[PDB]
Amino acid sequence: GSSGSSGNKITNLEIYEWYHRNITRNQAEHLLRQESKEGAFIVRDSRHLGSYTISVFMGARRSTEAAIKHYQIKKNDSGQWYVAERHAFQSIPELIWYHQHNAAGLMTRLRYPVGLMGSSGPSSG
């Protein structure tokens, strides 16, 4: 089971921008699609569980199509978050703290930290 508690939680992500909360698969990807540039990454919650998933834009090879990956952040017995299942951290905002400078997990070096306030994008129709 999963039931929150009374009051605000210690962990604060909303403060950041790369932490896209209150979104869904479509949103995560959609946002990246707008950037369509290697690096565009983000962080959302797993409607399934109280976890967090990182959505990065890989982009096709011949820049002809779009590519978006989804790295689910799991936790080990040591209650540490990890994406590459090789480097465990103590806080969510800590795992990406380094990654940004150096992936360190067969992942692209985050370049464009897609934040809540997106740059700009046209509307369907």
Measured CA to CA, the distance from residue 56 to residue 110 in angstroms comes to 8
Contact between 35 and 20 (Cβ < 8 Å): no
For this PDB entry, the determination method is NMR
Q: How many helices (H) and strands (E) does the chain have?
A: 2, 4
- Cα angle vertex 107, ends 120, 82, to 5°? 105
Q: How far apart are the first and last CA of the chain?
A: 42
Structure tokens belonging to residue 114: 């897609």
CATH architecture of 18-114: 2-Layer Sandwich (3.30)
